[PDB]
């Protein structure tokens, strides 16, 4: 009903942000994938 307006910003200020270090752990994980094109040799043509 009411018009949709941007309004004001909400992000607060942050100071002295420290880096993230990957934590060592013996526990298992799952490796986040990327699905995309694969490159391969033309082994048949290599035989030729």
């Amino acid at each position: 009903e009411k018009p949709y307006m941007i309004g004001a910003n909400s992000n607060p200020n942050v100071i002295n942000k420290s880096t993230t270090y990957t934590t060592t752990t013996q526990a298992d994980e799952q490796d986040k994938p990327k699905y995309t094109t694969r490159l391969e040799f033309d082994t048949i043509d290599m035989i030729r």
Partner: protein, 49 residues
């Protein structure tokens, strides 16, 4: 039957390796783009097997 005979074999075995040195051992990046905050990532080691 082969008590005092000789025997010879042609055999297939799995490939195996051990790390005899670690080379160009650490490579680093402060990845910051498209992250909430700076992150440290260890890039690939090279091994001399």
């Amino acid at each position: 039957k082969y008590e005092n005979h000789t025997v010879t074999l042609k055999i297939l075995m799995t490939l195996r390796y051990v790390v005899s040195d670690i080379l160009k051992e650490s490579r680093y990046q402060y990845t910051k783009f498209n992250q909430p905050k700076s992150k440290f990532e260890n890039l690939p080691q090279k091994l001399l097997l």
